[PDB]
């Protein structure tokens, strides 16, 4: 009954800090650091929501979004370390549900995760 | 067994003039004016190439690309009646194969359709 979140992020330090905060707030959270494994993992485990970094070893965020959408219908929240309008429009038009600039306050990330889960 | 083209254009007038020209030039051509109907028709009829307007009643051209690309792998030539900033990059990155601003001379459109069909 706890929402399952998958954090796809290559920055291990930030990913674990975020995972611990979300677990303390009633979420079941896993971490993936590779785009290729993230594609198979998202399709196989079917998490309730994905937090997806744009730049990853292997498949980048846009590729992950494109490859899972036909087999994964749950929300995708993208995170970026640099605010560029082009990448934000492409991420949303590719099928992402949100696109947030890093760094994001942990409580804001949780509020955005809860908002996305309300329409599933 | 001519190449099958689907023109997805809500401007019925231009669509029929283009259809007439392409049929006279050795192509089998159908016309669709609604984006939601274009998604179902592209996936079920599997045309050899789609000429896709970016602005349609129902699903927009970017939505048509996003929804057909998992099930349709033939060329998509996108058309726009008004160039907007970032429009070409988004369509090409979404899976379109070309992006042309109207008005396009009919002979130029035929040359572009033939060039795309050579990539198959
Ligand atoms: Ca990264
Ligand atoms: Ca990469
Ligand atoms: Ca139009
Ligand atoms: Ca529309
Ligand atoms: Cl994990």
Structure description:
- 2 copies of one chain form a homodimer.
- Chain A is α/β, with parallel strands linked by helices.
- Chain A has one domain (1-120): Response regulator (Rossmann fold), CATH 3.40.50.2300.
- Chain A is 45% helix and 20% strand.
- Chain A contains 5 helices and 5 strands; from the N terminus they run βαβαβαβαβα.
- Chain A has a 5-stranded parallel β-sheet with strand order 2-1-3-4-5, sandwiched between helices.
- In chain A, α2 runs parallel beside α3.
- Chain A is globular and about 35 Å long.
- The two termini of chain A are 14 Å apart.
- The interface between A and B is small, with 10 and 8 residues.
- One calcium ion (CA) is lined by residues 10-11, 53, 55-56, 81 of chain B.
- The PDB classes it as transcription.
- The entry lists the keywords Structural Genomics, Center for Structural Genomics of Infectious Diseases, csgid, two-component system response regulator, transcription.
- It forms a dimeric assembly.
């Amino acid at each position: 009954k706890l929402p399952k979140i998958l954090i796809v992020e290559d920055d291990e330090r930030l990913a674990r800090l975020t995972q611990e905060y979300l677990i303390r707030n009633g979420l079941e959270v896993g971490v993936e650091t590779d785009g290729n494994r993230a594609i198979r993992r998202i399709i196989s485990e079917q998490p309730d929501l994905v937090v997806l970094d744009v730049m990853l070893p292997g498949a980048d965020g846009l590729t992950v979004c494109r490859e899972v959408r036909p087999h994964y219908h749950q929300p995708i929240l993208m995170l970026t370390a640099r605010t560029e309008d082009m990448d934000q429009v492409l991420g949303l038009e590719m099928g992402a549900d949100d696109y947030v600039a890093k760094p994001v306050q942990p409580r804001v990330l949780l509020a955005r995760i809860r908002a996305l889960l309300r329409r599933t």
